[PDB]
Amino acid sequence: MTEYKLVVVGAGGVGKSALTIQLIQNHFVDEYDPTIEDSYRKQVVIDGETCLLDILDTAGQEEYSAMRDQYMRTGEGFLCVFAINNTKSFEDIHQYREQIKRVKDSDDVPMVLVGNKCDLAARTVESRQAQDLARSYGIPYIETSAKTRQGVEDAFYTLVREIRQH
Ligand SMILES: Nc1nc2c(ncn2[C@@H]2O[C@H](COP(=O)(O)OP(=O)(O)NP(=O)(O)O)[C@@H](O)[C@H]2O)c(=O)[nH]1
Ligand SMILES: [Ca+2]
Ligand SMILES: [Ca+2]
Ligand SMILES: [Mg+2]
Numbered sequence: 001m002t003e004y005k006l007v008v009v010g011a012g013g014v015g016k017s018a019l020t021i022q023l024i025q026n027h028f029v030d031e032y033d034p035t036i037e038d039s040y041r042k043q044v045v046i047d048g049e050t051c052l053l054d055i056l057d058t059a060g061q062e063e064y065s066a067m068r069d070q071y072m073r074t075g076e077g078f079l080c081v082f083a084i085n086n087t088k089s090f091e092d093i094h095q096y097r098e099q100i101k102r103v104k105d106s107d108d109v110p111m112v113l114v115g116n117k118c119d120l121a122a123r124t125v126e127s128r129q130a131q132d133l134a135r136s137y138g139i140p141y142i143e144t145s146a147k148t149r150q151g152v153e154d155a156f157y158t159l160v161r162e163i164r165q166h
């Protein structure tokens, strides 16, 4: 069956792990345990196609920035996550995109921009700002909450549908 290699990237604490765990295991991780690098696999049906999602959950802590080149090499599509209550995590997106762009030597890498924690009211990144960033990359913007599950499947499935346009 078709295998899709997804990689979830973004600053520390934006909810990369919570998003992936919500998708794969259907519960919300409330505590914060910083990730080094974890892998998840699950067979799903997306638009009538049975496929395997291989998801790499990466480190947001800058300490582990050295490991980025390896995972950017292998991944087929990237979920670029920031938190809507964390302006710095939004500003950090470009450095993730730029590295992906260098490594793939492509301006057309399948990606989705994800604004997570949309359940929180302390918003400092407005949807329109994020829409504009995504537009400049030629990719979709989707808001999510790993807490409520809002948008979680849409984000990952959209990344699959982007990989399929490439
Ligand atoms: N309210 C709310 N909290 C969230 C959401 N997603 C993650 N969190 C919380 O934010 C904290 C960090 O989540 P986590 O998934 O560990 O972040 P991360 O991006 O994987 N961190 P790291 O890069 O260090 O591995 C946790 O307390 C988690 O419960 C969300 O959508 N809503
Ligand atoms: Ca929990
Ligand atoms: Ca692009
Ligand atoms: Mg994590």
Ligand SMILES: [Mg+2]
Pocket (backbone or CB within 6 Å): 124
């Ligand atoms: Mg503002």
